[PDB]
Amino acid sequence: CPVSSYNEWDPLEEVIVGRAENACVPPFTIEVKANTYEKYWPFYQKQGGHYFPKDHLKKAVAEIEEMCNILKTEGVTVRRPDPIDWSLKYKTPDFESTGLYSAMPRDILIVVGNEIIEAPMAWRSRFFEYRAYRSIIKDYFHRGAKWTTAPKPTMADELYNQDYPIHSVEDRHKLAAQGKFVTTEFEPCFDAADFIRAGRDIFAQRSQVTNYLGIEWMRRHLAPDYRVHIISFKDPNPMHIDATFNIIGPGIVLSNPDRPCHQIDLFKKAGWTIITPPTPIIPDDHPLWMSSKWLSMNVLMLDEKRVMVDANEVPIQKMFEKLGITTIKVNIRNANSLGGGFHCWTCDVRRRGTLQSYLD
Amino acid sequence: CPVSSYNEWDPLEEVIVGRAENACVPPFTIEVKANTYEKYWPFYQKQGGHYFPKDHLKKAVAEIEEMCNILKTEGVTVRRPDPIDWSLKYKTPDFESTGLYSAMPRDILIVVGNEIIEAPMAWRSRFFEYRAYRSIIKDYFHRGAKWTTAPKPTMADELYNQDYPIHSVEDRHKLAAQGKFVTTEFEPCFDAADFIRAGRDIFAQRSQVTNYLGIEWMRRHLAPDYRVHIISFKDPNPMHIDATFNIIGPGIVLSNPDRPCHQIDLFKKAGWTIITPPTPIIPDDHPLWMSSKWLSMNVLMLDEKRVMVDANEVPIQKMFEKLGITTIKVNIRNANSLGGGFHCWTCDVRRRGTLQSYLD
Numbered sequence: 131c132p133v134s135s136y137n138e139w140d141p142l143e144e145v146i147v148g149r150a151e152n153a154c155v156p157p158f159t160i161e162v163k164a165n166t167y168e169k170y171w172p173f174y175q176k177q178g179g180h181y182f183p184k185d186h187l188k189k190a191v192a193e194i195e196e197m198c199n200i201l202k203t204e205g206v207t208v209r210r211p212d213p214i215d216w217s218l219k220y221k222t223p224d225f226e227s228t229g230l231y232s233a234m235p236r237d238i239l240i241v242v243g244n245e246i247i248e249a250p251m252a253w254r255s256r257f258f259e260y261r262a263y264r265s266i267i268k269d270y271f272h273r274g275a276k277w278t279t280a281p282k283p284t285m286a287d288e289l290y291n292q293d294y295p296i297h298s299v300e301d302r303h304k305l306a307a308q309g310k311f312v313t314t315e316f317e318p319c320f321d322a323a324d325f326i327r328a329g330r331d332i333f334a335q336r337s338q339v340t341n342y343l344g345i346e347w348m349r350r351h352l353a354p355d356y357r358v359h360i361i362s363f364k365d366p367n368p369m370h371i372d373a374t375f376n377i378i379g380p381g382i383v384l385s386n387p388d389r390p391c392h393q394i395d396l397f398k399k400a401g402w403t404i405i406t407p408p409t410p411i412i413p414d415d416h417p418l419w420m421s422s423k424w425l426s427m428n429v430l431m432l433d434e435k436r437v438m439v440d441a442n443e444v445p446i447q448k449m450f451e452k453l454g455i456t457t458i459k460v461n462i463r464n465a466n467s468l469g470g471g472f473h474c475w476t477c478d479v480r481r482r483g484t485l486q487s488y489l490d
Numbered sequence: 491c492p493v494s495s496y497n498e499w500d501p502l503e504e505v506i507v508g509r510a511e512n513a514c515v516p517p518f519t520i521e522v523k524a525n526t527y528e529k530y531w532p533f534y535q536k537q538g539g540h541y542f543p544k545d546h547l548k549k550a551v552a553e554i555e556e557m558c559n560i561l562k563t564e565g566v567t568v569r570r571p572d573p574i575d576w577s578l579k580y581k582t583p584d585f586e587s588t589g590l591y592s593a594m595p596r597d598i599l600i601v602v603g604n605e606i607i608e609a610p611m612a613w614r615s616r617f618f619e620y621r622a623y624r625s626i627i628k629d630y631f632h633r634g635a636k637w638t639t640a641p642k643p644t645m646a647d648e649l650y651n652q653d654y655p656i657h658s659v660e661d662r663h664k665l666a667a668q669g670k671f672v673t674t675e676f677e678p679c680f681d682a683a684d685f686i687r688a689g690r691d692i693f694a695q696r697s698q699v700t701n702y703l704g705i706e707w708m709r710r711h712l713a714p715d716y717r718v719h720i721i722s723f724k725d726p727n728p729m730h731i732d733a734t735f736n737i738i739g740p741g742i743v744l745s746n747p748d749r750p751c752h753q754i755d756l757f758k759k760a761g762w763t764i765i766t767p768p769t770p771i772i773p774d775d776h777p778l779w780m781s782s783k784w785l786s787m788n789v790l791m792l793d794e795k796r797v798m799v800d801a802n803e804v805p806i807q808k809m810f811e812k813l814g815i816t817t818i819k820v821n822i823r824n825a826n827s828l829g830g831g832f833h834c835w836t837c838d839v840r841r842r843g844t845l846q847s848y849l850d
Contacts, residue, residue: 151763152814188741188761188850195758213765215814 140483320344420469428471500843680704788831
C-alpha cells in the first residue's frame with residue numbers, strides 16, 4: 131500500500147508537493163478577513179477574484195521546482211496536484227465564489243496510517259480545492275489505500291459570524307481568548323493543518339477554520355486507535371498549527387515563543403523536549419499574504435536527523451545544527467508569500483515506520 | 491504594417507492557411523527516408539512522383555475550408571497560398587525533382603516582428619515551395635513589411651549522408667543521439683518549424699532538416715534583438731519542433747511526454763509551467779504519411795485563453811478546459827495525414843501585442 135504515515139519524522143519515502151500556478155486572490159469575505167493581517171485587507175479588497183501577482187507566482191514556481199529536485203535527490207518520490215484555473219466562479223445552492231489555489235496540500239489532506247483523509251475546509255474559496263488532488267488519491271485507492279472525505283460543509287451564512295468584531299489582529303487575539311471565532315458550531319468544518327501527528331496521539335486546536343464539531347468528527351472517526359487531543363495557545367495562529375507547535379521527532383517539539391501552549395505542562399510531564407526556535411530574519415517588507423514570519427519554523431523532516439529548512443533563516447539552521455540534525459537548505463522566499471513553508475507545501479504520504487505512542 | 495507577431499499566443503488577427511490541392515508524394519530519397527516511419531517507405535517507393543490519394547485530398551480540402559470558416563468567425567483574416575501543380579519536374583544544376591505541396595506554411599515561413607522570413611528548406615522536393623506564397627508576401631512588402639529569404643541551399647549530394655545507416659526509427663533515434671543526422675554541415679539549411687517563438691527568445695533544435703549552420707544563420711541574422719537558443723530532446727521528431735515543445739502562453743509549454751527536453755531545467759528555473767499532454771487517441775490504422783500521433787499537441791492559440799484543438803482528441807480538450815482555456819474544436823483528421831495539425835497548417839502573420847522577454 132503506497133499510503134502509510136503515522137507521524138511527522140519517520141524516513142520520508144513519498145510526498146505530494148503543491149502548485150503555485152493560477153493561484154487566485156480570494157474574495158474579501160469575513161473568514162478571509164479573520165485569517166489575514168490588516169496590512170493586507172485593502173489588497174484583498176482590490177485584487178479579490180484576480181490572480182496573485184504573476185511575476186511573484188513565476189518566482190514561486192521556480193523555487194518549488196527546485197524543492198522537488200532536492201526531494202528527488204534525497205530519495206523521495208514526488209507527486210504534484212493537477213493544474214487548474216482557480217479563477218472559475220462556481221455556485222452552490224448556498225453561495226457563489228471564485229477559488230484559491232492548490233499550493234498547500236497540508237491544508238486539505240492528512241494521512242493517518244493507511245488512510246488518506248480530505249478535510250472539509252471552512253473557506254468558500256476552497257470548496258472545490260479537492261478537485262486538484264483526486265487523480266493522485268484515486269491512484270492510491272486503486273493501490274489499496276483507504277480514502278475518506280470528512281463531511282463537506284454547506285458553508286451557509288450560519289457557519290460564519292458575519293459580524294465578527296475584528297478591526298486588528300489585536301482584537302482577534304482577544305476574541306479568540308474569549309472562545310469566539312469567525313466560525314460557529316453550525317456544522318463540522320476544519321483544515322487538516324490544525325492537526326499534527328505523533329503516532330497514537332494527534333493534537334488539534336479549535337481555530338478560526340477548525341471548530342469543535344470538526345475536531346469531534348475527527349476524534350469520533352479515528353477512535354479507538356487514535357486519540358485526538360485539543361490544545362490551545364496564547365495569541366494563536368488564526369489557522370493551522372504547524373508554525374506554532376511543530377513536532378519534529380519522538381518527543382521533540384518546536385514551540386513558537388510568541389504563541390505559548392496553555393497545556394505545555396502535559397508535555398513536560400511526558401518527558402518531551404520543548405525547543406523554542408530563534409526569531410525569523412525575513413524582511414518585514416516581504417509580502418506574506420497569509421501566515422506570518424514564523425514560517426521559518428514550518429520545517430519538514432525527511433527523517434529524525436534531516437530537516438528541510440529555509441536557506442535564508444540562518445539562526446534556526448544553527449539551532450538544528452547544534453542538535454545534530456542535518457540541514458537541507460532550500461530557498462522558498464517567494465513561495466512563502468502564498469501562506470506556507472515546507473510543512474504546508476507538502477503532505478507526507480509514506481514514511482517508513484510503525485504506529486507507536488510517545489506520550490507513554 | 492500588416493506583419494507583426496512576436497510569439498505564439500497574442501491575439502491572432504491574420505493568418506495564412508495552407509492548401510492540400512495537388513499535393514504530390516515526394517520521390518523516395520535519403521532525406522525523405524530519414525523523416526518518415528518504416529511502415530510508409532514502400533508507399534513512397536511506389537507512389538513517388540504521383541499525387542497523394544485524391545479521395546483523401548478531397549476530404550482534407552473540406553476539413554481545411556471549415557477551419558478557415560471557423561477562423562473568420564473567430565475574427566481572423568485568412569490568406570491562402572496560390573494553387574500550384576506540384577507534379578512539375580524541375581531541374582537545377584545540382585538535381586532534378588518533382589515537388590511536394592504548400593500545406594504547411596509553418597514549415598517555410600516564420601514571422602519575427604515586422605519581418606517575414608522564408609526558410610531555405612532541406613528537401614529537394616521542397617526547393618520551389620516558396621512560389622506558392624509570393625503573391626501574399628509581395629502584398630505585405632508593398633504594405634511595409636520586411637522580407638527576408640535565408641540562403642537557398644544548392645542541395646547537392648554533399649548536403650546529405652547518402653549512407654545514413656537507418657533501417658528503423660529506432661536506429662535514427664540512436665544516431666540522432668550520437669549527433670549524426672542525414673544532413674551534413676555542408677551549407678545552411680532549415681525548416682522554419684524547427685524554431686518556436688517566445689518574444690525575445692526563440693528556441694530551435696538541430697534536426698534532420700535543420701543544421702547548426704542554419705541555426706547560426708538565424709542567430710546571426712536576428713541578433714542583437716533576439717536570442718536564438720538550441721535545445722534538444724530524447725527520441726526527437728525527425729523534423730519540426732511544434733509537436734514536441736509547443737509554447738502556448740507567457741511561460742507555459744506543452745512538453746511531449748515521449749520526447750523529453752534535455753534542457754528542461756533551464757525552463758523550471760525561469761518559473762515556467764511545463765504541461766505534459768495526455769496521449770493521442772487517433773487510431774493506429776489512420777495513415778500519417780509524415781509526422782506522428784502527437785499532432786494532437788500541435789495546437790494553435792487564437793489568444794492566451796482560446797485554443798484551436800482537434801475535435802477528436804477529447805483527452806487534451808479536457809486538459810485545456812481544466813486550465814481555463816476555451817477549446818475551439820475542429821476536425822482535421824484527414825488533413826493530419828499530410829503531416830500537420832493546426833500550428834503546422836498555419837503561419838500567424840499578425841498577433842496584437844509587443845516584444846517582451848519571458849525568460850526574465
